[PDB]
Amino acid sequence: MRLIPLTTAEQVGKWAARHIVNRINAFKPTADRPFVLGLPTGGTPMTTYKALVEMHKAGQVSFKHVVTFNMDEYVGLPKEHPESYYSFMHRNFFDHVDIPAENINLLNGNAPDIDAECRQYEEKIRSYGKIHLFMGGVGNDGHIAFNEPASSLASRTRIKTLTHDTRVANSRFFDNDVNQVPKYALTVGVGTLLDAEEVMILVLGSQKALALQAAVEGCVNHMWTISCLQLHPKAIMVCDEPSTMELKVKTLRYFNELEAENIKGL
Amino acid sequence: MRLIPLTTAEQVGKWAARHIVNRINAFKPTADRPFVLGLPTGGTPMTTYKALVEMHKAGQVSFKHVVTFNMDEYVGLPKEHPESYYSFMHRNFFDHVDIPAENINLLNGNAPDIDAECRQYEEKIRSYGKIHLFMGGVGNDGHIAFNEPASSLASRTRIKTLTHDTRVANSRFFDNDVNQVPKYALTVGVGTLLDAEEVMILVLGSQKALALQAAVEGCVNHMWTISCLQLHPKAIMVCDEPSTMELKVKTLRYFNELEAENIKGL
Amino acid sequence: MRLIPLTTAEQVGKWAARHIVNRINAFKPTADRPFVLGLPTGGTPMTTYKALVEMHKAGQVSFKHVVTFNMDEYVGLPKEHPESYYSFMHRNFFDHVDIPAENINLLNGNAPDIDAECRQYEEKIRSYGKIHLFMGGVGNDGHIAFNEPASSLASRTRIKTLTHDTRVANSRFFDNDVNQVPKYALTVGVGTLLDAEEVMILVLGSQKALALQAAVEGCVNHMWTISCLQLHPKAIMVCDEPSTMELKVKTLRYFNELEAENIKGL
Amino acid sequence: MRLIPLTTAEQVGKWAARHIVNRINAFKPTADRPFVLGLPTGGTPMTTYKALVEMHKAGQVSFKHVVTFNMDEYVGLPKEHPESYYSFMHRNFFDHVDIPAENINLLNGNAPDIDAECRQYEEKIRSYGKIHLFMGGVGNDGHIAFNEPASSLASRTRIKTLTHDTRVANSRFFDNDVNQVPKYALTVGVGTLLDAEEVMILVLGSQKALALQAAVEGCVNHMWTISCLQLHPKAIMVCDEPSTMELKVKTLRYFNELEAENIKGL
Amino acid sequence: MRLIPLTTAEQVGKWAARHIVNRINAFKPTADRPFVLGLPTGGTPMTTYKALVEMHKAGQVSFKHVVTFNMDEYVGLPKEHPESYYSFMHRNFFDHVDIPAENINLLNGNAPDIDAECRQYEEKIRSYGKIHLFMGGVGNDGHIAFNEPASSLASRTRIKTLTHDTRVANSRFFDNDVNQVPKYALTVGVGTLLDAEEVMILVLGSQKALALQAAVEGCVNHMWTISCLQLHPKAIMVCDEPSTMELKVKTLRYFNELEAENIKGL
Amino acid sequence: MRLIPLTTAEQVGKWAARHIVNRINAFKPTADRPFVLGLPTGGTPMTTYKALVEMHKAGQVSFKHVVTFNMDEYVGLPKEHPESYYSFMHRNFFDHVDIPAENINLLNGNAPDIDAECRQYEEKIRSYGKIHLFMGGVGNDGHIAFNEPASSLASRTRIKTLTHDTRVANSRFFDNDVNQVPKYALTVGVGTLLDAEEVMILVLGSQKALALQAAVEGCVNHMWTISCLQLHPKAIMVCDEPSTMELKVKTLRYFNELEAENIKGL
Ligand SMILES: N[C@@H](CO)[C@@H](O)[C@H](O)[C@H](O)COP(=O)(O)O
Ligand SMILES: N[C@@H](CO)[C@@H](O)[C@H](O)[C@H](O)COP(=O)(O)O
Ligand SMILES: N[C@@H](CO)[C@@H](O)[C@H](O)[C@H](O)COP(=O)(O)O
Ligand SMILES: N[C@@H](CO)[C@@H](O)[C@H](O)[C@H](O)COP(=O)(O)O
Ligand SMILES: N[C@@H](CO)[C@@H](O)[C@H](O)[C@H](O)COP(=O)(O)O
Numbered sequence A, B, C, D, E, F: 001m002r003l004i005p006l007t008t009a010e011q012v013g014k015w016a017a018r019h020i021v022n023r024i025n026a027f028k029p030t031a032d033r034p035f036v037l038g039l040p041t042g043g044t045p046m047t048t049y050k051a052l053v054e055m056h057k058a059g060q061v062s063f064k065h066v067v068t069f070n071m072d073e074y075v076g077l078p079k080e081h082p083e084s085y086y087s088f089m090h091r092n093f094f095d096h097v098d099i100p101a102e103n104i105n106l107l108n109g110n111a112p113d114i115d116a117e118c119r120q121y122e123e124k125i126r127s128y129g130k131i132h133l134f135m136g137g138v139g140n141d142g143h144i145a146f147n148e149p150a151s152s153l154a155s156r157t158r159i160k161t162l163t164h165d166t167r168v169a170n171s172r173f174f175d176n177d178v179n180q181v182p183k184y185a186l187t188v189g190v191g192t193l194l195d196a197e198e199v200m201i202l203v204l205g206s207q208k209a210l211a212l213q214a215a216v217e218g219c220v221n222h223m224w225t226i227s228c229l230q231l232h233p234k235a236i237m238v239c240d241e242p243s244t245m246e247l248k249v250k251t252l253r254y255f256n257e258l259e260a261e262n263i264k265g266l
């Protein structure tokens, strides 16, 4: 596993954004072979989305042939509601890049048949073959996507009931009223994520310190689904300073020297 | 993973039995496509077997096209010995249902060539393709089937030497004399179980509290093979009240509300 | 998992060597179907290599049709340097057996293109199909091959940066000067090892007690890659007396009686 | 140890206030034998102070013969700053009850001689003999008073350097600017609290869930100073619902049966 | 801490009895300076009482000048009920030795004033000065006396509410009906036991394996009150084979070398 | 607890020596009130003794009025053997400073009456009142003095049987032959060290990394006797870089900010 010990969130977004750009450009997407990108929502990727937009405007990357798939979406929340993941994605990303509407894949949290929705989503990923790079975040309780503690490490896209603690964390976007945040959400499973060619998790803040420790130093278990990365052949964790506070000295020492050159880019 | 927090063993058997019935009926087994069912022995499934028999007598299910495979069988114990798993199954189940003798698959604990026996068993499962629902229990030390601590999480059907503690637990059926219980037994491996489409573990009693905690809150490891369910995409654990005593408040809180409707059937 | 509790290193080598011999002879290798053997370097296998050489000289085994693959090799160290794994293997083994030069596969730690080297190595294993028996050791920090803590449990052959602690341990062969030991090394991944038909780990000494405990009693995690054996269907650990000091009484009791006959050969 | 499991902060405040009132009234304090109350500051005790004031105005208690000692104070914060513990204690309690000015004891965070201030504080406690009841809170990191992780369990009143997490936690009262929160504070040591006849800690909110678990279910250690209560012959922990989430079901169950009557004021 | 590793309960009884006899005889008690023996009830001490009686009848000890104090008694159980600790102590020991009626001390579980009964009990111990040897057992949950999980490590004689597991465990003596086992009991606290000159705990059976491990290898904590012995300058634990199963090989090894001579009475 | 995080053993020696010198000079010892220094042997204190001698020769301290008490001594080792602690203390310290022969206190490992030797040793400490500063080291297994795992935390000076790991560790000084290392030794108990006004432990090398972690981050337990310092009101641990590797980043961070000024002698 690769862990990139950075200091600031701004640095994390810059690093993470440059990485996505390098992968796309190295891949050389065409209409027949698009680059499939997995994407998250929340506060963590904000700097990354900003960096990417900056790079696109500078003519450094084009998304004309990039296909995207988002990790999840709230159930029952209106599409046009400012806090739906659909709104989030467009406001913060799509509205500023040249990605065509065909290439955008979001889970329909208002599908008449929830079960058909999840099944079709998996089918969509399969049709393109494989997600090349899946970017995401980690929850306070260690959940990846919305695979809350006790989710199967082999799970597929399905409807999931959120842990009260997650709703409380997410209530920031709902005027701090827990009663506002949806009790359920459609999410890609751990198995889905594991099928991706490369997984890149952004970790920012002290609230994620126990989660990061669980992912790096812990054992594989379904209570902290983020630990599934230990079984992934190409996992990367980009973190800032405060999120590494629960790690051992030797753990952070090892990674710091591995990435020494890799992060001096500034 | 789904955990059904129930109060009484009677409730567990009722829930578990109704689930098996719903799956079979929803499947609609025919002579060409039978429903393959995995089954355990011991004290835990007693209420389930009783419920099933009740439902069959009421004309709610028929086993005329259900194929069964049992988890294990003692080595060296005579078939007709009242405590052989062969005797157990017929006395407690088969003797009361309309399952034809062809559809019954039990491990021969007295096979001249133990190695050929296990290999043929695996072959038998393969010929039908896949076990649809595998029901089982959990040992005090967390063993699933007779996969004692240190059994490979990728293991196949083989001969296994029982842990002294297991023999002591099983001595209840041998007039409480440990010297009576067989030292070895043929058992399906963790890999075998994992190949099943759905796994349903019944957990009853305080003796299983540490085991249940290990399965739900613990990490995957071969010392408590029951933890292999964390890697299974369709695992269900039906428990009574005393078995949930080692869980965290939040863990039992989460599941109780998930199953709230699902268990109100009474 | 099988654990062979032995007393002395001499006993370990004897047991381990006899096992390799039995497997080869039972396999009956020919030019078209060779027996593929995985091999380690270090101090642990010394008695095993000696035993094997003794057995070959006695006409008990021939390596004329055995193909070998070594776990790793230092990067940047000259081939002819007495402490390169290439030198180690020939001095301690190849120089005394009848294995033809074609059948010897070692990682080129001085390849102009490191990435091509690792890829070709994997290809080499694939061409023969599958490694039949992979013998190895365990590091103080639990690393198998040079898959240091935090290596992916699904990893493939690649270049790896060694943990300072490993270099310190390996400095014994470099006149006790840490500055002498290479900072990097080419190594087969955990995924590579897992693809082998049977894995046999030799464990000798008190320095490996925490590692052995992690492998046998611990949970699967990438910090102690040796724990990957829990997911392997055919893993064997041969140990001496001092390495079992961190195990539980019951754990060593169980294995001692399982192998009672199996080790009385003396 | 007693743990009063209530649901809301309002209840915790009523139980706390009620318990203090009963101790005082049962004590029948006089000028020659006053009751000695140790007190905390922070968000936790807010409901308890409100209830105490109420009961006082209602003629249920008189602090005419009660001497108070506060746990801590910030170093270098002006005594008139609305956020100094001195201000907190007057604004929220002293300004509303009938306690003599000479009966109030507070650590002076602006003392020219810090060691002298602290020593004289312990000596002022000694002159009275002992603190009959010491009320307190618990920090996110499990700190009792400002005895941060790694504080001696036999510590006395001395100055302490506040952990970054505590400063961030306390920034709440300094308009969310950590830079405004004092870096140091004078606090009573663990040994000083252990010398009280009875200790009562108030735990509210999910943020203290880990602290509560460490206190109740953990072992004695100086990283979570709240663990010192396990050594106290008379410790009570009053908690709301969210703070008990990290506890085992059995643990909560026990305390629920235990305090059934004692918590039904209604 | 000394741990006497024996094989059988019979041996444990002989070592225990022998050790008590040697202390008394070495003490040379007189009416003006009696020996003070603290004693337990339950299945564990049965072999020790048998051996004590024997040695007495054989003229090896005289309890003429020995004062006894028992650890606990059930609240609300008739003194004449065959299962009251009073009955147990007479049936199994007092009725067979030469100890004066005035030298026997037992807690009255039917005392109208429970706090008074308990206080006077501590005062009766104080009048004699100190308990020279306090013999005891250990509960499945690690309880010493009836100091259930979460009992203060500095606790005194007081009433305690018995854990459901203890009641279920003790149902053995109430014809397996938990409803017949008293819900409360008067017991000496942890601090009271810590005040004895020497403490000797008897551990028998695999059911105590976890309690023994917590005692010997765990940390000091109030959930497993037997951990208080780590704080005692003179504690001995006499155990049989099954009770040591959860211990590390090294731990058992150490004690075996340590007590070699001391356990070879033969 | 204070932890001085330095980089090298040379620095640790300078900080240690400097701290001892300041205590003595600040104490202003006289013949009627001498300073009492407790001292250790082994490789760890080598740099501290060198620096003490230096400072002495430089006229910075006088041991004319300093009484010394050493922690331990080997049983059955000739007082003139170059490896006896007596020899160590003279060769490395006494032979170079101005301390009176009557001010030196050492345990006699060849005492005909071991209990008497040990008792009189505690009595000699009592006559002086108390040890003002007790300097020590830590064993790989976390032992303070020779209080091996499972030693009472309230232990006094007595004889102890050395753990095999300690003997192997100490073989360094007996030309690597464990058979030459004494099996027993007289040592001050945990309670004796806890009675010192201040304790200062020296930790050097990666081999002590686990001992340091147990001491700083672990819980109080008798398997790692160094954990007793958590109970000491005045304990300091001086460490080099390698010994801190098992600590959490946050833990090291805290101590670094804490000791910044205090470690910059330069
Ligand atoms: N909503 C999910 C991502 O789409 C989830 O994994 C999320 O990243 C996690 O809850 C962290 O959220 P944050 O970025 O707002 O901290
Ligand atoms: N015998 C096995 C099931 O066939 C085993 O898994 C069994 O379920 C387990 O030992 C639990 O037994 P119990 O149901 O008697 O408690
Ligand atoms: N060098 C590797 C084997 O090729 C590594 O796994 C090695 O076995 C391990 O470091 C143990 O070394 P040792 O045998 O020298 O103890
Ligand atoms: N500041 C101390 C109380 O005086 C401390 O114990 C406090 O209770 C703790 O930091 C928690 O603060 P809170 O009450 O604001 O949660
Ligand atoms: N009842 C107490 C002894 O008087 C308790 O310590 C007892 O030893 C423990 O409950 C174990 O009971 P057992 O001796 O019946 O196993």
Ligand SMILES: N[C@@H](CO)[C@@H](O)[C@H](O)[C@H](O)COP(=O)(O)O
Binding pocket: F039, F040, F041, F042, F043, F044, F045, F071, F072, F136, F137, F138, F139, F140, F143, F144, F145, F146
């Ligand atoms: N022998 C004792 C010191 O007198 C012991 O505390 C010692 O410090 C410990 O065994 C470590 O030895 P070392 O100093 O040689 O590392």
